[PDB]
């Protein structure tokens, strides 16, 4: 299929990635830079993020979802359902509202596209209504992450997709902080895109630290595989 060919041929080997985030949560401002690489053949991403403005004023785990669904491994039988690749190289916009139960919310807008050979994710994040001493601004979340399936559906009237999913962040007292994610993606280009049947992406996420890095940072390894269309 010469459509499956095009986005395919952009993601076949290892692709360098750059991430840029501008953040303001309760007027606590911050910037993050990331660098790494994706290999969509294995659904594999390797990323390191650095808070360039000093201390990250929120827990690194709360930004994981915000910081590349084009690097999902779509099984051969599911290639016609891969919206994210199909929008490239012009890219797509990914928008979210993430509601932290009994605390504030993030609203994120990102543009995901190629700049030459580099896949770039430029993000703006605004957080409002957080409790200064809650789990988020009070840094009460553990530095870890659970696996989660994420259910994609077409949003045909917007020529894009919608995703809704829950993340449960572990609190240091053994409880959980729910983070209810609402998401919409739309192509940046005017060309045709693949609009998927309902399916899901299974995510596994490992957070770590670079022993040689003194700046506030996060090392992220994610494996992402599409499924649900037998």
Write the burial class of residue 196 (CB in 10 Å: 0-12 exposed, 13-18 middle, 19+ buried). Answer: buried
CATH number of the domain where residue 215 is located: 2.40.155.10
**Rounded distance, CA 115 to CA 176, Å?**
39
Method: X-ray
Total domains in the fold of the chain = 1
Q: To one decimal place, what's the resolution in Å?
A: 1.4
Question: Backbone phi, then psi, for 134, in 5-degree steps?
Answer: -75, -170
DSSP string, the chain: -HHHHHHHTTSSS-EEEEEEEEEEETTEEEEEEEEEEEEGGGTEEEEEEEETTSS-SS-HHHHTTT--GGG-B--GGGGGG-HHHHTTTT-EEEEEEEEETTS-EEEEEEEEEEETTEEEEEEEEEEES--TTSTTTTT-B-S----EEEEEEEEGGGTEEEEEEEEEEEBTTS-EEEEEEEEEEEESSSS----PPSEEEEEEEEEE--TT--SSEEEEEEEEEEE---
Question: Backbone phi, then psi, for 101, in 5-degree steps?
Answer: -50, 130
Write the burial class of residue 198 (CB in 10 Å: 0-12 exposed, 13-18 middle, 19+ buried). Answer: exposed
Range of the domain at 139: 1-230
Tokens of 134: 């809650």
């Amino acid at each position: 299929d010469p459509m499956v060919s095009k986005g395919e041929e952009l993601f076949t080997g290892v692709v360098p990635i750059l991430v840029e985030l501008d953040g303001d949560v309760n007027g606590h401002k911050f910037s993050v830079s990331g660098e790494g690489e994706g290999d969509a053949t294995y659904g594999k991403l390797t990323l390191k993020f650095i808070c360039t403005t000093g201390k990250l004023p929120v827990p690194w785990p709360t930004l994981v979802t915000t910081f590349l669904m084009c690097f999902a491994r779509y099984p051969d039988h599911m290639k016609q359902h891969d919206f994210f690749k199909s929008a490239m190289p012009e890219g797509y916009v990914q928008e979210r509202t993430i509601f932290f139960k009994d605390d504030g919310n993030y609203k994120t807008r990102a543009e995901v596209k190629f700049e030459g050979d580099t896949l770039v994710n430029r993000i703006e994040l605004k957080g409002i209504d957080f409790k200064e001493d809650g789990n988020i601004l009070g840094h009460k979340l553990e530095y870890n992450y659970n696996s989660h399936n994420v259910y994609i559906m077409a949003d045909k009237q917007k020529n894009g997709i919608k995703v809704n999913f829950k993340i449960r962040h572990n609190i240091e007292d053994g409880s959980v902080q729910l983070a209810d994610h609402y998401q919409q993606n739309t192509p940046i280009g005017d060309g045709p895109v693949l609009l998927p049947d309902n399916h899901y992406l299974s995510y596994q996420s490992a957070l770590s630290k670079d022993p040689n890095e003194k700046r506030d940072h996060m090392v992220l390894l994610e494996f992402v595989t599409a499924a649900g269309i037998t």
